Design a binder for this molecule. Structure first.
Ligand SMILES: [Mg+2]
Length: 228
């Protein structure tokens, strides 16, 4: 493997903190839960601490810890994400919503003590007033997808590209093209992978006891695409 994967053999508590501005709508989200990379499993509850979320929850799922992906044993030499731990990595994305605006995100993912933390800044521009995002026309659900990873050896890191399809309430789909880059924060060696993908499955729900604007997420992520 890598030395960093030793930090992931058990259940790890997670904290997520996001500050956002989409078209001048300022918001924050705080999340808590845990990850168990042995099973590729994430359980997180997110709360909008500023009030009502000004964009649909599903549009934030990808932004709101791929170090919890399950890498099969035969592929463990391809796990960049854990290899960068505990010092962590910077994750940047451009998320381009077809016929609408874009999110640019910058996150730092690292350990703070025994807790894995994801700190994010999100900026959204050029959204349509009553497009699917600011008009809240997206269903509260989520389709499975693959995250296609490639090495970026000049930057000592990785890139990824994938497509999210958000279901629109009228039966159509809102495409969200994702371009991602990750670079280590520390100077220790990291694993630079062969092309492969992360198979991701996400289920969204609500806490029946929660009155704040929130999202409960159950996610499974498994690396694939390299055989033996
Ligand atoms: Mg302009």
């Amino acid at each position: 493997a890598s030395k960093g994967e030793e930090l992931f053999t058990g259940v790890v508590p997670i904290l997520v903190e996001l500050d956002g501005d989409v078209n001048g709508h300022k918001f924050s989200v705080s999340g808590e839960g845990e990850g168990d990379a042995t099973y590729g499993k994430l359980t997180l509850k997110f709360i909008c601490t500023t009030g009502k979320l000004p964009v649909p929850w599903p549009t934030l799922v990808t932004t709101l810890v791929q170090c919890f992906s399950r890498y099969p044993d035969h592929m463990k030499q391809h796990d960049f994400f854990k290899s960068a731990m505990p010092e962590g990595y910077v994750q940047e994305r451009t998320i381009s919503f077809k016929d609408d605006g874009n999110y640019k995100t910058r996150a730092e993912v690292k350990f703070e003590g025994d807790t894995l933390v994801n700190r994010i800044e999100l900026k959204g521009i050029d959204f349509k007033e009553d497009g699917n995002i600011l008009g809240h026309k997206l269903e509260y659900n989520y389709n499975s997808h693959n995250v296609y990873i490639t090495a970026d050896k000049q930057k000592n890191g990785i890139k990824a590209n994938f497509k999210i399809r958000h279901n629109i309430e009228d039966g159509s789909v809102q495409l969200a093209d994702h371009y991602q880059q990750n670079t280590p924060i520390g100077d220790g060696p990291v694993l630079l992978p062969d092309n492969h993908y992360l198979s991701t499955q996400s289920a969204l729900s609500k806490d029946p006891n929660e009155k704040r604007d929130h999202m409960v997420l159950l996610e499974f992520v498994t690396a694939a695409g390299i055989t033996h």
